[PDB]
Amino acid sequence: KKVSITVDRDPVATSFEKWAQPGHFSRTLAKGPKTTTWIWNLHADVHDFDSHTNSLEDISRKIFSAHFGQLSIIFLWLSGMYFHGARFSNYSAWLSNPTAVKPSAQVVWPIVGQEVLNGDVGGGFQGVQVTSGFFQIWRSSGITSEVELYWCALAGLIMSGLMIFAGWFHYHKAAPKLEWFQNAESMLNHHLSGLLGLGCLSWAGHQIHVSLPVNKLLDAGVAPQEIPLPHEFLVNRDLMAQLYPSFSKGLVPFFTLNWSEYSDFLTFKGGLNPVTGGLWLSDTAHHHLALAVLFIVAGHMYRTNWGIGHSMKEILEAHKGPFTGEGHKGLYEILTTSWHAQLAINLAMLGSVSIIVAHHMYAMPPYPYIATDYPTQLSIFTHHMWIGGFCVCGGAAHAGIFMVRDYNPAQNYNNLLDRVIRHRDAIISHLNWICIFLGFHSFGLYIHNDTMRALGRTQDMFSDTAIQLKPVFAQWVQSIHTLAPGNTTPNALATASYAFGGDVVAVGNKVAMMPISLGTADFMVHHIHAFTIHVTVLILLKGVLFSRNSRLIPDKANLGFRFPCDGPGRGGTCQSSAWDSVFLGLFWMYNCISVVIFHFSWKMQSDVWGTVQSDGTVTHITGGNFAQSAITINGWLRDFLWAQASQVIQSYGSALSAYGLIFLGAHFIWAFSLMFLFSGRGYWQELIESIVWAHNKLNVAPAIQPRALSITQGRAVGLAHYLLGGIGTTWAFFLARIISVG
Amino acid sequence: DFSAAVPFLKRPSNLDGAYIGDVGFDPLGFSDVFDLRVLREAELKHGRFAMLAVLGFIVQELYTFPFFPKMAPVDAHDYFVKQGGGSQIIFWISFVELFGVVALFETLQGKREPGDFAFDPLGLAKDEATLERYRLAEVKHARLAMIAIGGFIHQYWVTKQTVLEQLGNF
Amino acid sequence: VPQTVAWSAKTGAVMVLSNILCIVAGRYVIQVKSGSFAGFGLPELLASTSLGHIVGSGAILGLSYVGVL
Amino acid sequence: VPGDAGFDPLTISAWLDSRWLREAEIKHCRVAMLAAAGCIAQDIFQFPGAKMTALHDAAVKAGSMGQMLFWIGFVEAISTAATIQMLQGGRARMELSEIKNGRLAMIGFSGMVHHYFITGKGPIELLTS
Amino acid sequence: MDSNFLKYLSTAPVLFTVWLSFTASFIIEANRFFPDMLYFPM
Ligand code: CLA
Ligand code: CLA
Numbered sequence A: 001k002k003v004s005i006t007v008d009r010d011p012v013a014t015s016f017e018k019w020a021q022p023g024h025f026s027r028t029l030a031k032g033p034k035t036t037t038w039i040w041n042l043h044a045d046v047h048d049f050d051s052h053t054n055s056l057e058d059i060s061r062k063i064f065s066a067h068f069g070q071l072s073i074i075f076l077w078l079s080g081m082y083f084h085g086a087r088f089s090n091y092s093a094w095l096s097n098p099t100a101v102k103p104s105a106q107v108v109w110p111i112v113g114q115e116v117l118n119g120d121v122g123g124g125f126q127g128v129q130v131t132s133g134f135f136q137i138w139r140s141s142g143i144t145s146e147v148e149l150y151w152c153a154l155a156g157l158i159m160s161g162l163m164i165f166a167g168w169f170h171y172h173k174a175a176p177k178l179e180w181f182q183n184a185e186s187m188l189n190h191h192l193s194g195l196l197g198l199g200c201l202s203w204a205g206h207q208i209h210v211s212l213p214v215n216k217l218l219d220a221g222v223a224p225q226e227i228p229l230p231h232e233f234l235v236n237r238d239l240m241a242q243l244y245p246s247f248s249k250g251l252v253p254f255f256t257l258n259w260s261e262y263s264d265f266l267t268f269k270g271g272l273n274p275v276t277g278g279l280w281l282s283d284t285a286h287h288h289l290a291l292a293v294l295f296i297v298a299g300h301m302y303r304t305n306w307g308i309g310h311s312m313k314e315i316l317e318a319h320k321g322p323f324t325g326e327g328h329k330g331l332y333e334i335l336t337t338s339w340h341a342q343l344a345i346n347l348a349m350l351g352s353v354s355i356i357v358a359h360h361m362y363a364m365p366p367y368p369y370i371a372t373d374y375p376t377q378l379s380i381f382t383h384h385m386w387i388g389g390f391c392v393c394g395g396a397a398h399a400g401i402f403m404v405r406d407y408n409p410a411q412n413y414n415n416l417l418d419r420v421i422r423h424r425d426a427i428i429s430h431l432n433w434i435c436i437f438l439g440f441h442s443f444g445l446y447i448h449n450d451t452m453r454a455l456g457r458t459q460d461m462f463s464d465t466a467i468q469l470k471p472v473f474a475q476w477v478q479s480i481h482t483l484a485p486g487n488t489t490p491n492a493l494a495t496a497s498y499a500f501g502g503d504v505v506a507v508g509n510k511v512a513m514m515p516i517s518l519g520t521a522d523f524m525v526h527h528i529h530a531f532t533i534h535v536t537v538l539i540l541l542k543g544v545l546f547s548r549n550s551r552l553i554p555d556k557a558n559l560g561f562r563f564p565c566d567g568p569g570r571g572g573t574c575q576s577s578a579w580d581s582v583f584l585g586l587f588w589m590y591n592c593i594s595v596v597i598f599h600f601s602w603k604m605q606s607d608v609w610g611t612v613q614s615d616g617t618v619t620h621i622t623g624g625n626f627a628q629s630a631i632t633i634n635g636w637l638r639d640f641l642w643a644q645a646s647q648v649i650q651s652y653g654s655a656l657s658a659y660g661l662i663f664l665g666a667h668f669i670w671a672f673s674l675m676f677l678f679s680g681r682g683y684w685q686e687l688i689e690s691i692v693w694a695h696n697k698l699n700v701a702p703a704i705q706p707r708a709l710s711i712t713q714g715r716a717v718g719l720a721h722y723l724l725g726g727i728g729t730t731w732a733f734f735l736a737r738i739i740s741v742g
Numbered sequence B: 001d002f003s004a005a006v007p008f009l010k011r012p013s014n015l016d017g018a019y020i021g022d023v024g025f026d027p028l029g030f031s032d033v034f035d036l037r038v039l040r041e042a043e044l045k046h047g048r049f050a051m052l053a054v055l056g057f058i059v060q061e062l063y064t065f066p067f068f069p070k071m072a073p074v075d076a077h078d079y080f081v082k083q084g085g086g087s088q089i090i091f092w093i094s095f096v097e098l099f100g101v102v103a104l105f106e107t108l109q110g111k112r113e114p115g116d117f118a119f120d121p122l123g124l125a126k127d128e129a130t131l132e133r134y135r136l137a138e139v140k141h142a143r144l145a146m147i148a149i150g151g152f153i154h155q156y157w158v159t160k161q162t163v164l165e166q167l168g169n170f
Numbered sequence C: 001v002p003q004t005v006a007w008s009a010k011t012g013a014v015m016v017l018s019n020i021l022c023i024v025a026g027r028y029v030i031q032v033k034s035g036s037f038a039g040f041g042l043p044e045l046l047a048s049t050s051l052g053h054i055v056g057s058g059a060i061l062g063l064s065y066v067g068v069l
Numbered sequence D: 001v002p003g004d005a006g007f008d009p010l011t012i013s014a015w016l017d018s019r020w021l022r023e024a025e026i027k028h029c030r031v032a033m034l035a036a037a038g039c040i041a042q043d044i045f046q047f048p049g050a051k052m053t054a055l056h057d058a059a060v061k062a063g064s065m066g067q068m069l070f071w072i073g074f075v076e077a078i079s080t081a082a083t084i085q086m087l088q089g090g091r092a093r094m095e096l097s098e099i100k101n102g103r104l105a106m107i108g109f110s111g112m113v114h115h116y117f118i119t120g121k122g123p124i125e126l127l128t129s
Numbered sequence E: 001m002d003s004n005f006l007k008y009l010s011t012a013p014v015l016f017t018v019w020l021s022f023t024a025s026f027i028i029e030a031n032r033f034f035p036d037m038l039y040f041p042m
């Protein structure tokens, strides 16, 4: 029983004393401010626990309680989304008429004329149109009334109180010891089996006993208040049998392994529900049940307290061949003693999963009536692409912090890390070459096309009409997925997604999904994507691999993760740290995700979204101009940015005038950021000297001596305002455009 | 040692007869986490409100003031929400509760017993021994009335008859 | 839809077979613990029988799929 | 230690707390005692306003089982405080008689409910008919 | 009230947020009761 619970009782006293002493957590800051830099230095390093404390136990305790605090904030946020849906929304009107009422769960107060933002969203309601897709989530859950939304808001509030209590309790009353946190096998067993498997299983039970009957009654056309309450499905099996007759047999088919009895509600239909334009909820129920079994089985892999199971260290140490030295030896010790190494992995995975979520949710729209709510589809794609890109760059930020701080060569002799660092010149030179080749042969095709179109030579272009770059591999994969139902997935009835090919799905005379054809423009923008992803990897990988030392600075690890430079010598070593590669790689992340969301926005408006009409023909939002105009830069400038900025710039005096104002405000903030990015600290310190003189003249100089921001903070302020302004401008443009036309 | 009330439950250990009416009953362990002066403040405040409420529920059945219309106490709540009297009662309670906040801070700082507001106009507490028995009776009545008020309101909901008339009928 | 069958003694047979198979095979393969009377305890029995119901359920469903039953 | 016939063939006692096992067994014993004595008593005589298994759903609709669940749930919350504090730290014949009659009651109740599945009847009714 | 909690409420970010929230609140109230004051009325 070496996996055991071990707790220190009453470690830290619940006192307001250290609240009154800002900077108490570090020896430098606790002696008080003398310059304004102290103030910035206070906020910058506060959650950097391993810079204040030496011991891994106290660091682990602070992290566990901070995770409860984050959970409390998320639960309060969810409770507020449910409360605003219950109290300030037109959810009931939306349930009666989804394809006509526009969701709105935010109402403004009348103060300075701002009540113009309460536009006519429909259903006898005035408010701000919301695009988070909560209404479709609630309808998929089977909510059907505001009263149940009040109970969900209360459940969120109770959970939020329980998490903030638990964070206090587990830091101040009962803090686990380090040997409790250093149980990776136990934690994985419980998080796979218990967190994921039970979670999937419990959700599958809700879908089978609540979501599936309520939604079958809704899609038959029954009014929401005419639908029986969800517990009458739980007790009276006769009504559930009337909807799905397999329930007449109960749990005998489950236990005797006669599982094909349950095919009424555990289907493998594929495709979309024609009524709602969403995934079949019988498919999602079978999906969650299948995942639950796999996750619970996965949870029995690792050894905890009874001899069955794997040792994770033995698995890692056995995988070594003739190219890779000692192999994965020493990685277990890293990943159970370094929090930063774990955060680097988990941030890269969370970001990757968020980008996958973004792709899978527009192509296989899971919620009822979310496919034809085009503002929601554009919003949730753009949001999860930005979360993915940010989390992916934070994985490289904390890989750099690991290398600078937690990496020790004595325990990493001739293993995989040692070998990567010992051929990092070959890695970065080959990646650098790939980024040059791929920028020439992706963006230079655009420059070739602009020049030929400008010269009158349209036969010399890379286009469908002229020289053709055909995405043959992607077209072939689309063919395979269209041929799959009945062939390589024989029990499937429809394709996984209509994007691959097949029918046009229309809901409320709007296209839910239809095949997304690929041509020369799709080949070109996909290689644009491959190029922007490659260089972002190069900037972040070069920062992680050269974080400790280079040919330039042989002792970079002694300066730390975040230092501004090592002086003007050696020609100049400005921005040589690992932090400065995270700083430079967030710009290239911004560039990559901006072209991805622009590609999505133009391609869906041009070729997928639109209104079905007589004869079955479809009129798209921008009328199929992507194919012949996404091949030049002038086409993107004119037919995408200029043509679609009409709604944001003409929005004044309407309910979308808020987007019109945020468009300008973010354009302003973006420009304001370049003051911090193009300038240097020394100018601003000398300007502050003359302003200090004028304060000295009037005897009003402060005792906290004003300083220009540090070199690193100047870079961080410039990057933060750059990201805010660029993303905010895209946010305002995307939302005003798709609310007006979609 | 074991709890006096529940023989098989252990004594909580923050409850050693410091507060009158203690019988060692605290299974969920709120005194192991929270301040007992604050909890006894809350127990006596909830109990005093409940004791007044039960007396009000019965007397309001027996008599009502001539200037107000006759009606049942839950309907009285809704009528005085819309009439303005409820806001007056809420305001004056809130006004007294301001100096109650000051009183609770004085209790936390150690210089006041949790339910003591020095409210003895009629001098009933003649001696210290009389006060101990009286505050035991206050604690017991306060707890009993919390249970009682819940019963009257919930039964009124389930069967639309007032407490004296429900005893009178059935 | 793949065809499954109501429980019969053949389904019981497949379950019993897979269960005994997993006892013996697990007894050799498991690396931490009189062929079955040395060091055989409840977690080993419960693990071999859990893999037995996994192998047996897969075997029953597959043999029902192909027609062997 | 009471009712120790040396019968632990699978050796569950090695891989679960003996106190937890005894408290669970004595709870199972007493619940089945009440259930079996009640099972026969329901057919012997009946309370006013009022089979073996169908009566569960005939009783839930009134709200009787919900009420009994609420009160057992209250007692079981105090009993989970009891078992946690048990676990965190001329009469022996009477305990042994309790444990034996309780194991017998578990067998008897199991018998009556499956006999109900066999014939749709209660225990002593089956004996009479 | 505890002197260390009152010393926390005297810290610069708390006083800054409270003072400008109070300032924002009486500008909002003045523009609620007296809106569209383009000129000093005289
Ligand atoms: C967590 C997310 C969240 C968000 C973003 C919002 C956002 C909003 N809510 Mg909602 N709300 C939420 C959760 C949320 N709410 C929850 C959980 C509940 C349930 C209790 C509600 C219940 C609710 C109601 C009942 C109403 C709103 C309203 C509003 C709007 C105006 C709020 C306002 O100006 O009041 C401002 C109110 C003040 C008292 C101003 C306080 C400003 C202080 C100074 C902030 C200071 C914080 C402090 C200094 C932090 C440090 C602590 C200290 C010790 C130092 C706004 C759109 C209003 C609305 O929609 O009207 C149409 C409305 O009436 N909300
Ligand atoms: C079955 C057991 C189980 C479960 C469910 C969890 C669940 C969780 N752990 Mg883990 N953990 C476990 C065992 C378990 N742990 C063990 C054995 C150890 C020791 C090795 C750890 C050590 C550990 C650490 C060190 C950390 C976590 C963290 C977390 C949270 C991850 C963030 C998240 O997704 O939360 C959001 C998702 C939710 C579903 C929120 C649910 C909140 C409750 C707690 C879930 C369980 C409630 C209860 C079982 C359900 C009753 C159901 C009933 C109504 C029928 C999550 C609540 C992290 C964290 O955030 O800490 C707070 C963290 O830092 N865990």
Ligand code: CLA
Residues within 6 Å of the ligand: A043, A044, A045, A046, A047, A048, A049, A343, A347, A390, A391, A392, A393, A394, A395, A397, A398, A401, A561, A562, A579, A582, A586, A720, A724
């Ligand atoms: C689960 C996620 C997670 C976690 C736990 C951490 C945790 C940590 N990071 Mg990592 N990081 C993450 C995600 C995460 N980060 C991501 C996604 C990125 C990519 C951008 C990074 C990039 C990164 C770098 C580059 C650095 C860290 C550092 C740190 C540490 C210090 C934190 C601190 O004191 O900041 C205090 C917090 C602040 C000062 C907050 C201000 C930040 C912005 C400007 C405010 C947010 C703006 C808001 C959202 C929008 C405003 C609205 C506007 C319209 C007004 C801590 C270990 C630092 C370090 O040195 O550690 C050793 C460090 O240099 N991280």
Ligand code: CLA
Residues within 6 Å of the ligand: A432, A433, A435, A436, A437, A438, A439, A440, A443, A444, A447, A535, A538, A539, A584, A587, A588
């Ligand atoms: C429009 C602005 C712009 C342009 C063109 C570039 C161009 C480049 N950057 Mg820079 N960068 C920019 C803005 C820009 N950046 C900004 C704002 C930042 C701020 C954070 C950075 C930060 C940055 C970093 C941190 C990195 C780059 C890298 C790169 C290179 C990528 C490799 C490549 O595509 O080679 C191909 C070249 C191009 C696509 C440029 C256009 C050339 C086209 C095809 C026309 C060619 C015309 C031809 C030569 C004419 C010949 C005749 C003429 C002489 C008369 C390339 C040199 C990376 C690098 O060097 O890795 C290789 C790298 O690590 N950049």
Ligand code: CLA
Residues within 6 Å of the ligand: D031, D033, D034, D035, D036, D037, D038, D039, D041, D042, D045, D046, D047, D048, D050, D055, D056, D059, D064, D071, D072, D075
């Ligand atoms: C745990 C076993 C058990 C269960 C589930 C039930 C359940 C039921 N019985 Mg049966 N019954 C029991 C024991 C049980 N009884 C016993 C021991 C007797 C003999 C006295 C009877 C005699 C009996 C008759 C004669 C009748 C019922 C009836 C009923 C129904 C209505 C509820 C009622 O009046 O309870 C009656 C139960 C009792 C009088 C004794 C209950 C035993 C204990 C004290 C209750 C447990 C709850 C307890 C307060 C909390 C736990 C604390 C614990 C440590 C003591 C319901 C089907 C009536 C009915 O609807 O039939 C159609 C009916 O006519 N039962």
Ligand SMILES: CC1=C(C#C/C(C)=C/C=C/C(C)=C/C=C/C=C(C)/C=C/C=C(\C)C#CC2=C(C)C[C@@H](O)CC2(C)C)C(C)(C)C[C@H](O)C1
Residues within 6 Å of the ligand: B051, B052, B054, B055, B119, B120, B121, B122, B123, B124, B125, B140, B141, B142, B144, B145, B147, B148, B149, B150, B151, B152, B155, B163, B166, B167
């Ligand atoms: C402090 C102080 C003073 C004072 C004062 C004052 C105003 C004191 C007033 C004290 C009061 C009002 C005490 C009332 C307690 C009520 C109880 C115990 C509940 C009983 C009901 C039960 C048990 C029931 C029931 C039932 C249910 C639920 C529902 C029914 O269908 C059935 C049924 C009836 C059986 C004064 C001013 C004198 C001066 C002094 O110097 C200091």
Ligand SMILES: CC1=C(C#C/C(C)=C/C=C/C(C)=C/C=C/C=C(C)/C=C/C=C(C)/C=C/C2=C(C)CCCC2(C)C)C(C)(C)C[C@H](O)C1
Residues within 6 Å of the ligand: B074, B077, B078, B146, B147, B149, B150, B151, B153, D074
């Ligand atoms: C919202 C609304 C209103 C309202 C209202 C109000 C005031 C509603 C009332 C709420 C109250 C006081 C509920 C009381 C519950 C007490 C219980 C369940 C006792 C449980 C004891 C148990 C389980 C056993 C206890 C145990 C046993 C064996 C006995 C001994 C003790 C113990 C060992 C602990 C109005 C009227 C204003 C109308 C308005 O327009 C809207």
Ligand SMILES: CC1=C(C/C=C(\C)CCC[C@H](C)CCC[C@H](C)CCCC(C)C)C(=O)c2ccccc2C1=O
Residues within 6 Å of the ligand: A675, A676, A677, A679, A680, A681, A684, A685, A707, A708, A709, A710, A711, A714, A715
């Ligand atoms: C303007 C500028 C300054 C001076 C900027 C200073 C001194 C910031 C002071 C602004 C006031 C004092 C605080 C700003 C508060 C704003 C109202 C917004 C607050 C945002 C949150 C931090 C609250 C630099 O120090 C600098 C250093 C390196 C490269 C570029 C630059 C640079 O461009």
